[PDB]
Symmetry: D2
Subunit: 199 residues, 4 copies
């Protein structure tokens, strides 16, 4: 699995990325985006990860927004303009190396309840996270309940437990941020009060 | 993450020739109160070592999960032969059951076991004697911590050796973390930690 | 193998900006009647290229499956935006639908496409223009045949190159086999076979 | 995936095999049985496969009856007495090489309906097959329906379609055997009329 501090080798390709994809983020005007190969995508664990990709002609930090099912471990399918920053587009497929980075990013994490969320059933997506998210939990009285991440990058409470309650997220470095006062309001990005530490 | 505390599940109970060995990679035991859990609820070993109180037509018994039943449906439990006779007529073969996760009295702290062949270059760690089911295990890497993915065979594995032999911390399904140090990198020896998870009412 | 001929399914229809590219690895198309199928029913690309007749409040439309929708539930279809408007009011966004597999009129035989980079050491073959969903693909190895496993990206792959460039035979979900020869080991070119699967009433 | 005509390398271990296991076969007095590592087991595709295993002290053909989740690709967890034919039990873990074989085996294939099979739901297991089975289908009028194999080595018709009808099985070599007159009778092994070719 993808780990910080490790340089991976693979192949870079490109596609018509818009920001929509398997991570269920919104379309973006930012070109520095990519789909990650299925293996490394890891059931959305790498959604929103920033990776710095080196190609024959340059390097660029991109955000993972999508999954590439036919790409092999180590492979990255960059957006068309992102690819042109690191390689000649005529080459089509080029050697790359890349690493997971913890970049500058302003503001706190935010939370988005999935369409149709209520106290009976809900899903939560984390947005604006500096480092990849490992887990999400919701408070159930005196204890907390982990919500399983789905490949489409929402953490789901299938029976509604904890929906509308306190939320806490833990990144891949082991840091936990706890958030109160997130309303049970589908389709709105709600800021928390903290960001993960820049590593 | 189907199985949740505070929920009563319905299903069918069957039995098999359980010895204590199985998909959770625990040891043979003389204890009767053991069972295999259906694949769905087993949940990639998240329910390994869980204690569930099972009610059948002839009684109730708290059993620990030591194995996985691939053909059993959600809600189903394949009990050890002697455990089944405590809650049902063995001649029946298959009976209606209800069950729930429990947080029982348990003596001693959690323990850790390094997998055969573990070194600083590759390792796996199994948790033993945990009062509540374990959700996650991490090892310390300098100033940060690294999650080790649990395999279906109930070891949390560090494929590149990072954190092997370092501090360990485990988080149960209720959200409580226990941190342990001084666990030596010694394969196939159970080593006690400092504490047990809280008993949940 | 959830989706079966002769069965009608209920679910929810939504829409997305479909261009024809997607998880089935087909080419961009100007055709209206395309859709993504929910992950469960997509079934590891078994439903790639399936034709389903979808009914919504405004009427019915036969669409071909070109993509997979991971967040959609069993029974759900994520139609192309223009296709959706044939069966429902786009302002509604999400509508009840019913649908079933169809065996439509289709011109010409099946065709085969070797994946980029296919050689004697590794190859993948995609089937195109098939009237009914494909179940299996095999390549001839001397006196026997070898199944190539379908990947979720809708190529049947020979991981070690065995049978690459050999005779090919495909079996549809109705159990009919078509055997084809003379398909060259030439990546990125659609090569026609000699026959189409039977039209099923 | 496991193919004929290839020599695989791995490690041999042993366990208390009785014949019961992930393939849902019955207990047997034959000691020449083994569990195959999860990857090569391949969702029961290798259930009932015969593999010839060479260890440091001997060679033995065993039948796959079970799955070993912690074993790596190429690894075989033999029954205790089978292991003792190819290695000293005190060694515990030994290098092995093995191949998929098409051995002598008498009688035709047989079929077993799973407990609880009816016109509304059924499962079918194939027994006494010389070569591994790839697919099983049941006849639905003028067409045939593939039944998906489960990891527990029954092919299941979730809605009962084809249950009690004609059955046909195709082995990994591409040979199809068709059988009529198999009754919808749970828990009995019913012989077909043919065996797969000895390759």
């Amino acid at each position: 699995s993808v780990q910080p501090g490790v340089t991976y080798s693979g192949e870079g390709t490109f596609y018509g990325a818009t920001g929509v994809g398997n991570c269920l983020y919104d379309a973006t005007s930012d070109i520095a985006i990519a789909a990650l190969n299925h293996t490394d995508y890891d059931n959305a664990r790498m959604c929103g990860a920033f990776i710095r990709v080196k190609g024959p002609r340059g390097e660029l930090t991109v955000r993972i927004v999508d999954r590439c099912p036919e790409c092999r471990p180590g492979d990255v399918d960059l957006g068309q303009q992102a690819f042109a920053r690191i390689a000649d587009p005529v080459a089509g497929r080029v050697p790359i190396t890349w690493t997971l980075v913890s970049p500058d990013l302003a503001g706190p994490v935010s939370y988005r309840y999935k369409e149709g969320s209520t106290q009976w059933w809900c899903g939560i997506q984390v947005r604006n996270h500096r480092n990849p998210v490992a887990t999400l939990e919701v408070r159930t009285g005196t204890t907390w309940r982990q919500l399983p991440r789905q490949e489409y990058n929402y953490f789901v409470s299938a029976d509604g437990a904890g929906c509308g309650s306190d939320i806490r997220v833990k990144d891949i470095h082991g840091q936990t941020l706890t958030d109160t006062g997130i309303a049970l309001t589908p389709n709105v990005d709600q800021p928390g009060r903290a960001q993960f530490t820049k590593r």
